[PDB]
Amino acid sequence: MRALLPYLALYKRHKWMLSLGIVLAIVTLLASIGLLTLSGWFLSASAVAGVAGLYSFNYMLPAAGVRGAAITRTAGRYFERLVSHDATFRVLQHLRIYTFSKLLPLSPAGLARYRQGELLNRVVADVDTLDHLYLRVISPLVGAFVVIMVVTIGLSFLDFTLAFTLGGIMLLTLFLMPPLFYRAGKSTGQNLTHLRGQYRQQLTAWLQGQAELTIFGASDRYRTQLENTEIQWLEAQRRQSELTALSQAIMLLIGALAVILMLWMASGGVGGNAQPGALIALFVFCALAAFEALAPVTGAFQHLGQVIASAVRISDLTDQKPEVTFPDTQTRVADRVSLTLRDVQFTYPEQSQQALKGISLQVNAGEHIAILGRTGCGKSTLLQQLTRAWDPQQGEILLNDSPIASLNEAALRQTISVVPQRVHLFSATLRDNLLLASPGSSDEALSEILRRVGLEKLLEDAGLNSWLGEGGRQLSGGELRRLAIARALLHDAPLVLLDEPTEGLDATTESQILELLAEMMREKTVLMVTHRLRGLSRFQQIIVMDNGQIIEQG
Amino acid sequence: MNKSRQKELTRWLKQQSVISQRWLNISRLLGFVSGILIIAQAWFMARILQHMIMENIPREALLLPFTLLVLTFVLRAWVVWLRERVGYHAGQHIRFAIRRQVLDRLQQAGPAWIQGKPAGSWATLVLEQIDDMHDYYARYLPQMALAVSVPLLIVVAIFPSNWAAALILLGTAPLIPLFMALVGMGAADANRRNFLALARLSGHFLDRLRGMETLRIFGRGEAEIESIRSASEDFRQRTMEVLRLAFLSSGILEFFTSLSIALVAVYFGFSYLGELDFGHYDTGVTLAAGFLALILAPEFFQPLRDLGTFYHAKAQAVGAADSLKTFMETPLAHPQRGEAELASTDPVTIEAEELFITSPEGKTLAGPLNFTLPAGQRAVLVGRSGSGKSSLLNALSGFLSYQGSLRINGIELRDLSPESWRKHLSWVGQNPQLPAATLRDNVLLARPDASEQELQAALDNAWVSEFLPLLPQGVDTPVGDQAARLSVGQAQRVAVARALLNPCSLLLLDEPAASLDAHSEQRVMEALNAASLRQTTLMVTHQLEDLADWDVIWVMQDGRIIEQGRYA
Ligand code: HEB
Ligand SMILES: Nc1ncnc2c1ncn2[C@@H]1O[C@H](COP(=O)(O)OP(=O)(O)OP(=O)(O)O)[C@@H](O)[C@H]1O
Ligand SMILES: Nc1ncnc2c1ncn2[C@@H]1O[C@H](COP(=O)(O)OP(=O)(O)O)[C@@H](O)[C@H]1O
Ligand SMILES: O=[P-]([O-])[O-]
Ligand SMILES: [Mg+2]
Ligand SMILES: [Mg+2]
């Protein structure tokens, strides 16, 4: 339970809103226990008095209590759900920011090993899970621990023995049942996630290899293996559903145990009175209604298991040391830059063969160089050291005959602007999708770039205000690439190194190099990398390289 | 919204329900049996309480009701234990059957259709979209059958005792749905006004988290936190207006479960005093008739309250139902399986006279084409990108249905048994995947029971043993995209080992040296040129400098071969 400490300091920030939902949770359960225990007493107080004692029985006050408790229960339940969700949503932004802030310095390096499609979908999944810690594990538990104390102290004014044995039964199960079930489903919950990832890994490798699992006749053998894991997986799910049924069947027996005991012992008498007329119904009905307070505790061991497992994943992911460090020298923005590489080597973590061996190339300022790698062979890996995502080992990177590690983060991002291999639409207005390049830029200047690069088609109908990404219209693969160069023009840098601009598109690939020399041809350096040998002759020092090493460079 | 679809979609779910109809009736029956025990509970407690409070009977004397009340508690906790086990078993057989129908329809549709969608989103449909259909069958339905049965037993059980208390509980029976619909016309308006925004603004954090690489290059790393805070400070105050009215639909259930207990307490409380003499059947209002109504007053609304929690599991099993229903309503075309045999393991003489290749979606791939090469002949295909030359390789394997006429050694391929036809086939794609757990189990994919000596012969032929020392565990190194990955130069040299291990009749090389390093290219070509002359082969490589010995060359540009002949 020590994994929750980093994610509990983000709740202490909103402790004065989180505690209002808990206090509202206490009231709406006391108002529901009080409504029914007063009803139970009032129902038996009048019956004992009978019609004879009608004029000698004050029913004005009990009739006000059932009216007061009815409004309190219905209003408190409504205001609980608002404040509880209001605080849940307010701590969510402190979890999205905390996860994003930690994951950002190590975004290229610390997230390399994982499948980015499933890893990021997982991270968002286990940020919501951590967000429900208060709403399912704290509020049900903390809100029910003090509700028991209030009724125990409240019933203590009538009989110490009856009040404590009911409170002792309630408090014992609150403090003992959640742990004995978290300690029982811990093994299954660990085994259930292992098989979920084992079934998903076998299924993905079965669908992807479906073309060659049928030719060689192994498509049915690997399906039996696939379904055997599902049989094991669906039995681990059954075991965790044999505890949900057991936890729900036990507190209906404990809630029973606290009803007979109130029926049985209170017959002997409450306080010193050996013949309790109506106070028998005050204790049995309190015990009958007070186990709805511990009702949300059921299943709070399942919800605690996922939350603690989710806290482990994020902690194991956002506590990695950054692979690269940026010293802060506050250097000025360099101009007319020119780098060089001398025997740059680099192997990825948990690898036994290098992806870059003996790379050495020298670039002058204002020179256009194309690196041609036929497939793999670290053409896109070489660009990562230049942007400084990984640190080369047994290698030297020099920029303007100075080490690249001397640049601070603000200056390094300024001097180097890259169009990535895969372009990202950020699901914002086309205006806000280009402000990434330049934080502050006049709209009129910004709108010129789109029509300059041949992207004026997007400006037809409120283009700069049109939504992009998933919500709006998706740019086509050829058209999306035309937007990356636009983001490389607003954020003008002395070194603008490209990365496969011509890949995947053919209708407008001819015009693509045109603006690559229409405005990138003046006082600029481009390390364009492609395997498409087309119109590359206009680039000096063309370099071909395979297996992670430069061979027969021009 | 989609009223036309939702009614139809909510009907497909019930057709899937028939798979586990035996348990969904036992779970419904136990809902009635658990209903009876609640009244059995409320009567024994009421009769015990009346005797003690009114007749002052000692507890030891009325021990028989005590030992009966305990028995119902044990017998009521038993059905609760039993209901959420039959409920799970009812929801598991649905998932097991659908997952088997989805996988079955995804296997005999061929690998031609699986390429249409990324394998991550196939695993998203088989993992999450079928597990989301659990709580609807396992929890929601066994609860909606408890919200219509159990509360009716209480009214049926108090009506003999007091018709006034029966109407108090029953008076809110029509009032609750009316008020939810009266507040639902405002909740569904705001939920429609914010429908555009929240859907557009919920996937904001993921998109920023998914594009961190693009977000740190341009230096916007510390400027997007101000855009995650501002897109989550709006998500709250925009969904706190949908919630503000969505929590009234539940407050007007806590309003009636409190008004109905206050009224039962006030009416019965005043009835004993002699104020309200209108409820009983002219036999006096006994105390036990009041406790029976008081204990059952919360139990009447308990089922309607719990159904509110599991109600989200209905749209979750519908939002995950349009993905599965439309999956099994696609008109995709099967490869027209048949039964036949090839007696001779010798190279087959494939031929055609008028042939068409069609996708499972129905789109045509290759136009009218025809070609013949006898046994032992080694053809080769060249063409422009998008000409459809791989389709012919992809349809000679049986993955693509053909409506023309392709013949294998004088036997029509349509009626040929695919399960036995592929035993005379070998296939090497341009981008081959490695489905086996380890490299040793990967070369031995055609014949797992191959002797270790036979395995060593294949490795040396495929030039994969040369880089074996580089890998840590030698030949048993696990292979994949997450543990000790091989380069495309090496991963291609183990797919070559697969094809040459078990002798075949027709070899379908599909650009073996398309994305391959210079050193591995000459190793694969030396292996695959000496392993193509001993049977009929069909190469589709695009580089054509070394075609001197390839006897026949077919070139196709728009789904049809234009000229066939030797390199000379
Ligand atoms: C559609 C609208 C809505 C929405 C949006 C939502 C959204 C949400 N949510 Fe909700 N809910 C609801 C409507 C709703 N909801 C309801 C109605 C209910 C019932 C009542 C109450 O609340 O209580 C609930 C309930 C609930 C709960 C508890 C349950 C019980 O009671 O048992 C929880 C925990 C939650 C969470 C949540 C979250 C996290 C979220 C985020 C996404 N939720
Ligand atoms: N299921 C499918 N698989 C492949 N192509 C398809 C499919 N459905 C339609 N097509 C279209 O039909 C054409 C068939 O040509 P295909 O790409 O299969 O052969 P190819 O040109 O040899 O492949 P490549 O371009 O990778 O060399 C493609 O251009 C593609 O756009
Ligand atoms: N995240 C990673 N982890 C480990 N190895 C990698 C990773 N990315 C690439 N590699 C290896 O490094 C080599 C260089 O790949 P790369 O040049 O990035 O591919 P591409 O040229 O298609 O962009 C590849 O052969 C690959 O096996
Ligand atoms: O994978 P290639 O385009 O660098
Ligand atoms: Mg790349
Ligand atoms: Mg092809």
mmCIF file with all atom_site columns, C-alpha atoms in Angstrom, chain B residues 448-508:
data_model
loop_
_atom_site.group_PDB
_atom_site.id
_atom_site.type_symbol
_atom_site.label_atom_id
_atom_site.label_alt_id
_atom_site.label_comp_id
_atom_site.label_asym_id
_atom_site.label_entity_id
_atom_site.label_seq_id
_atom_site.pdbx_PDB_ins_code
_atom_site.Cartn_x
_atom_site.Cartn_y
_atom_site.Cartn_z
_atom_site.occupancy
_atom_site.B_iso_or_equiv
_atom_site.pdbx_formal_charge
_atom_site.auth_seq_id
_atom_site.auth_comp_id
_atom_site.auth_asym_id
_atom_site.auth_atom_id
_atom_site.pdbx_PDB_model_num
ATOM 1  C CA . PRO B 1 448 ? 7.408  -29.485 -35.567 1.00 0.00 ? 448 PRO B CA 1
ATOM 2  C CA . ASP B 1 449 ? 8.512  -33.109 -35.070 1.00 0.00 ? 449 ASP B CA 1
ATOM 3  C CA . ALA B 1 450 ? 11.557 -32.641 -37.323 1.00 0.00 ? 450 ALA B CA 1
ATOM 4  C CA . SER B 1 451 ? 14.785 -34.150 -36.024 1.00 0.00 ? 451 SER B CA 1
ATOM 5  C CA . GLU B 1 452 ? 17.498 -31.842 -34.714 1.00 0.00 ? 452 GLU B CA 1
ATOM 6  C CA . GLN B 1 453 ? 19.787 -33.007 -37.527 1.00 0.00 ? 453 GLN B CA 1
ATOM 7  C CA . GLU B 1 454 ? 17.161 -31.985 -40.090 1.00 0.00 ? 454 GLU B CA 1
ATOM 8  C CA . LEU B 1 455 ? 16.837 -28.633 -38.309 1.00 0.00 ? 455 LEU B CA 1
ATOM 9  C CA . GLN B 1 456 ? 20.582 -27.994 -38.594 1.00 0.00 ? 456 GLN B CA 1
ATOM 10 C CA . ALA B 1 457 ? 20.499 -28.677 -42.342 1.00 0.00 ? 457 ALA B CA 1
ATOM 11 C CA . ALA B 1 458 ? 17.820 -26.021 -42.865 1.00 0.00 ? 458 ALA B CA 1
ATOM 12 C CA . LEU B 1 459 ? 19.702 -23.415 -40.816 1.00 0.00 ? 459 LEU B CA 1
ATOM 13 C CA . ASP B 1 460 ? 22.930 -23.766 -42.803 1.00 0.00 ? 460 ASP B CA 1
ATOM 14 C CA . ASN B 1 461 ? 21.011 -23.685 -46.094 1.00 0.00 ? 461 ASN B CA 1
ATOM 15 C CA . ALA B 1 462 ? 19.197 -20.485 -45.071 1.00 0.00 ? 462 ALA B CA 1
ATOM 16 C CA . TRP B 1 463 ? 22.392 -18.817 -43.745 1.00 0.00 ? 463 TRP B CA 1
ATOM 17 C CA . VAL B 1 464 ? 20.724 -18.118 -40.398 1.00 0.00 ? 464 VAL B CA 1
ATOM 18 C CA . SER B 1 465 ? 23.353 -19.977 -38.343 1.00 0.00 ? 465 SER B CA 1
ATOM 19 C CA . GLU B 1 466 ? 25.949 -17.350 -39.296 1.00 0.00 ? 466 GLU B CA 1
ATOM 20 C CA . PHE B 1 467 ? 24.394 -14.727 -36.993 1.00 0.00 ? 467 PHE B CA 1
ATOM 21 C CA . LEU B 1 468 ? 23.233 -17.264 -34.392 1.00 0.00 ? 468 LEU B CA 1
ATOM 22 C CA . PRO B 1 469 ? 26.106 -16.428 -31.963 1.00 0.00 ? 469 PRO B CA 1
ATOM 23 C CA . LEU B 1 470 ? 25.037 -12.764 -31.999 1.00 0.00 ? 470 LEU B CA 1
ATOM 24 C CA . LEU B 1 471 ? 21.739 -13.591 -30.298 1.00 0.00 ? 471 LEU B CA 1
ATOM 25 C CA . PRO B 1 472 ? 22.032 -14.319 -26.551 1.00 0.00 ? 472 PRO B CA 1
ATOM 26 C CA . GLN B 1 473 ? 20.386 -17.745 -26.221 1.00 0.00 ? 473 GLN B CA 1
ATOM 27 C CA . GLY B 1 474 ? 21.467 -19.027 -29.640 1.00 0.00 ? 474 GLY B CA 1
ATOM 28 C CA . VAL B 1 475 ? 18.625 -20.697 -31.525 1.00 0.00 ? 475 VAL B CA 1
ATOM 29 C CA . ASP B 1 476 ? 16.087 -20.733 -28.656 1.00 0.00 ? 476 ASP B CA 1
ATOM 30 C CA . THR B 1 477 ? 15.967 -16.932 -28.354 1.00 0.00 ? 477 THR B CA 1
ATOM 31 C CA . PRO B 1 478 ? 12.363 -15.694 -28.047 1.00 0.00 ? 478 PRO B CA 1
ATOM 32 C CA . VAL B 1 479 ? 11.431 -13.662 -31.114 1.00 0.00 ? 479 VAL B CA 1
ATOM 33 C CA . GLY B 1 480 ? 8.901  -10.869 -31.453 1.00 0.00 ? 480 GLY B CA 1
ATOM 34 C CA . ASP B 1 481 ? 8.452  -7.108  -31.337 1.00 0.00 ? 481 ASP B CA 1
ATOM 35 C CA . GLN B 1 482 ? 9.170  -6.801  -27.599 1.00 0.00 ? 482 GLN B CA 1
ATOM 36 C CA . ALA B 1 483 ? 11.983 -9.262  -26.743 1.00 0.00 ? 483 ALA B CA 1
ATOM 37 C CA . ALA B 1 484 ? 15.283 -9.598  -28.645 1.00 0.00 ? 484 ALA B CA 1
ATOM 38 C CA . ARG B 1 485 ? 13.902 -8.560  -32.007 1.00 0.00 ? 485 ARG B CA 1
ATOM 39 C CA . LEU B 1 486 ? 15.670 -9.670  -35.182 1.00 0.00 ? 486 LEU B CA 1
ATOM 40 C CA . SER B 1 487 ? 16.429 -7.190  -37.929 1.00 0.00 ? 487 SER B CA 1
ATOM 41 C CA . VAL B 1 488 ? 14.493 -7.436  -41.182 1.00 0.00 ? 488 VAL B CA 1
ATOM 42 C CA . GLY B 1 489 ? 17.710 -8.830  -42.639 1.00 0.00 ? 489 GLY B CA 1
ATOM 43 C CA . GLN B 1 490 ? 17.657 -11.683 -40.128 1.00 0.00 ? 490 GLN B CA 1
ATOM 44 C CA . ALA B 1 491 ? 13.889 -12.118 -39.769 1.00 0.00 ? 491 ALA B CA 1
ATOM 45 C CA . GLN B 1 492 ? 13.741 -12.720 -43.522 1.00 0.00 ? 492 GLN B CA 1
ATOM 46 C CA . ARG B 1 493 ? 16.461 -15.387 -43.284 1.00 0.00 ? 493 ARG B CA 1
ATOM 47 C CA . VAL B 1 494 ? 14.312 -17.431 -40.880 1.00 0.00 ? 494 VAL B CA 1
ATOM 48 C CA . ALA B 1 495 ? 11.207 -17.215 -43.077 1.00 0.00 ? 495 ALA B CA 1
ATOM 49 C CA . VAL B 1 496 ? 13.390 -18.682 -45.825 1.00 0.00 ? 496 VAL B CA 1
ATOM 50 C CA . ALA B 1 497 ? 14.298 -21.502 -43.428 1.00 0.00 ? 497 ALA B CA 1
ATOM 51 C CA . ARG B 1 498 ? 10.574 -22.189 -43.004 1.00 0.00 ? 498 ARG B CA 1
ATOM 52 C CA . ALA B 1 499 ? 9.902  -22.583 -46.725 1.00 0.00 ? 499 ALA B CA 1
ATOM 53 C CA . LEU B 1 500 ? 12.849 -24.881 -47.473 1.00 0.00 ? 500 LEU B CA 1
ATOM 54 C CA . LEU B 1 501 ? 12.581 -27.179 -44.437 1.00 0.00 ? 501 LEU B CA 1
ATOM 55 C CA . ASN B 1 502 ? 9.674  -29.272 -45.740 1.00 0.00 ? 502 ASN B CA 1
ATOM 56 C CA . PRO B 1 503 ? 9.792  -30.134 -49.468 1.00 0.00 ? 503 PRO B CA 1
ATOM 57 C CA . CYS B 1 504 ? 6.851  -28.826 -51.468 1.00 0.00 ? 504 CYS B CA 1
ATOM 58 C CA . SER B 1 505 ? 5.387  -28.682 -54.988 1.00 0.00 ? 505 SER B CA 1
ATOM 59 C CA . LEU B 1 506 ? 4.680  -24.993 -55.676 1.00 0.00 ? 506 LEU B CA 1
ATOM 60 C CA . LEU B 1 507 ? 6.823  -22.267 -54.094 1.00 0.00 ? 507 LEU B CA 1
ATOM 61 C CA . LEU B 1 508 ? 5.332  -18.767 -53.896 1.00 0.00 ? 508 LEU B CA 1
#
